[PDB]
Design a protein around this ligand. Structure first.
Ligand SMILES: Nc1nc2c(ncn2[C@@H]2O[C@H](COP(=O)(O)OP(=O)(O)O)[C@@H](O)[C@H]2O)c(=O)[nH]1
Ligand code: ALF
Ligand SMILES: [Mg+2]
Lengths: 319, 193
């Protein structure tokens, strides 16, 4: 009688972001106190994020936009990411303010920026850019993360998490899980009484490799995971819906990187969002061996998810 | 190198060696059941089931296996075979003759088993990649966590695991699940399970 929905997808595909949207759109939302709890995470995203950047500038031998930024680079690398609080992805406000001047200087440095543009050569989430471009609002002493800030904050997921909610008297239970290889062993514990699977794919990961083994192309991994799921007879009764998430990032990306450089099959305008989206859909549809529903989403955009979930709900209820 | 923004990732043994070779996979019933759960759920069961049944027939006396030779034929090689496997036409024909004269088919049968090995090995390889994706537990690998290399210890786990295969064997049509069950248990029972 309950509509149970499982969120699956490789690491960083946007599962937890979708989860948060369900709470904002159909649940209690996030009051100020709840949003304040994300502050430590947000400050941590930024410090660790900038640290990866200066480490990348160096190792990729990218020149400094200005040598004086070397001293700021030194301050950041000296930050111990293995200390207690940092280990669990958190940073106090007072400590964050000590690194602010240096972080702001580094973000303005063209070498640092160049390194960011070459992030596919290492591992870095694109939301660190969002927070670096908003250092001003993060720096005020009375800063309270906005709803948008909350959706962008990066908190790696380990283990299983449930979130119950209702939509017009229908009870929903959504299950969220981690997506890295090591966390997928926990996927089998939830497949019980599952009505539907939402499979998230970061549509803009075609030029990136896995964090697990910096060699396997991300889209390849997503495709293979999907192929094992959709072809498993145990799931013939379950409604699988595909979410080509991060549409906004894909849109930007196709303007500077070509999918042809990573997937030969592509024959069309690599600068055309519509052609890349069609190609991606084809890739996933082609994996089924024997009605595959799909949506292009932007999990960080509440309005988009609101209209997308309405379609999902109708599909599931009618199947 | 270049540091990661998330340094707390832990990847999480030699079960790897057992899954890549059919000979030893057959000697480790518990592991075999996992692989069968994979095949039955994701692929064409014919090749493996045919191979396993043909194995039992090989290790049985020529005077105590005529009925098993007929079942093998009707389930896997016959024209209307429910779990038809594709083998060389020459092979099909010669096995057909031998049985129609009550001769010793084991030789060409062994060649039929070898020809099917190609697809089985591909499936063995497909499963290894599922393992690499960390989806092992999807097919029962959790029932291996805590297995010392003991023959008797394992045979007990083969049961219970096998006793729970009906779960997958149900998603099938009675005309396909029946012969499958026949095949599965034909080999398992000969393995003391
Ligand atoms: N720009 C953009 N960022 C996104 C989108 N979906 C998720 N993110 C960001 O991607 C990062 C990883 O997402 P998360 O939901 O934690 O991933 P999960 O590992 O699948 O749970 C986070 O910082 C999210 O804000 C999207 O559609 N667009
Ligand atoms: F990258 Al995850 F949950 F898959 F944090
Ligand atoms: Mg998550």
């Amino acid at each position: 009688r309950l509509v149970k929905i499982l969120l699956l997808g490789a690491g960083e595909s946007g599962k937890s972001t979708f989860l948060k949207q369900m709470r904002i759109i159909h649940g209690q939302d996030f009051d100020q106190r709840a949003r304040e709890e994300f502050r430590p995470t947000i400050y941590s995203n930024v410090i660790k994020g900038m640290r990866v950047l200066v480490d990348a500038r160096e190792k990729l031998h990218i020149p400094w936009g200005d040598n004086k930024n070397q001293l700021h680079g030194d301050k950041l690398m000296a930050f111990d990411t293995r200390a207690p609080m940092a280990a669990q992805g958190m940073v106090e406000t007072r400590v964050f303010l000590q690194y602010l001047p240096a972080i702001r200087a580094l973000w303005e440095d063209s070498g640092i920026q160049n390194a960011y543009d070459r992030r596919r050569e290492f591992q870095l989430g694109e939301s660190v850019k969002y927070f670096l471009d908003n250092l001003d609002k993060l720096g005020v002493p009375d800063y309270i993360p906005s709803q948008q800030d909350i959706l962008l904050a990066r908190r790696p997921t380990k283990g299983i998490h449930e979130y119950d909610f209702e939509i017009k008297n229908v009870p929903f239970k959504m299950v969220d899980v981690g997506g890295q290889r090591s966390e997928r062993k926990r996927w089998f514990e939830c497949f019980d009484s599952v009505t539907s699977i939402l499979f998230l794919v970061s549509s803009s990961e075609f030029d990136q490799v896995l964090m697990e083994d910096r060699q396997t192309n991300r889209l390849t991994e997503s495709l293979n995971i999907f192929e094992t799921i959709v072809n498993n007879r145990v799931f013939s009764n379950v409604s699988i819906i595909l979410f080509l998430n991060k549409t906004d990032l894909l849109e930007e990306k196709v303007q500077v990187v070509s999918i042809k450089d990573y997937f030969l099959e592509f024959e069309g305008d690599p600068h055309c969002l519509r052609d890349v989206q069609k190609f991606l859909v084809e890739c996933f549809r082609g994996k089924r061996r024997d009605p595959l529903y799909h949506h292009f989403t932007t999990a960080i955009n509440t309005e988009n998810i609101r209209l997308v979930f309405r379609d999902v709900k109708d599909t599931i209820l009618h199947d | 190198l270049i540091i990661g923004p998330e340094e707390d990732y832990d990847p999480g043994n030699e079960s790897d060696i057992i899954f890549q070779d059919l000979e030893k996979l057959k000697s480790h019933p518990a592991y075999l059941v996992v692989f069968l759960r994979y095949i039955l759920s994701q692929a064409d069961p014919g090749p493996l089931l045919f191979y396993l049944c043909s194995e039992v027939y090989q290790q049985t006396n020529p005077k105590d296996s005529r009925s098993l030779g007929k079942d093998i034929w009707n389930i896997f090689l016959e024209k209307n075979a429910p779990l038809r496997v594709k083998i060389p036409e020459m092979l099909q024909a010669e096995i057909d003759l031998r049985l129609r004269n009550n001769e010793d088919p084991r030789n060409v049968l062994c060649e039929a088993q070898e020809a099917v090995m190609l697809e089985i090995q591909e499936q063995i390889n497909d499963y290894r990649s599922k393992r690499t994706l960390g989806l092992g537990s999807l097919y029962g690998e959790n029932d291996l966590l805590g297995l010392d290399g003991d023959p008797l210890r394992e045979r007990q786990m083969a049961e219970k695991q096998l006793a729970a295969l009906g779960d997958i064997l149900s998603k099938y049509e009675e005309d396909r699940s029946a012969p499958m069950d026949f095949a599965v248990n034909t080999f398992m029972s000969h393995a003391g399970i």
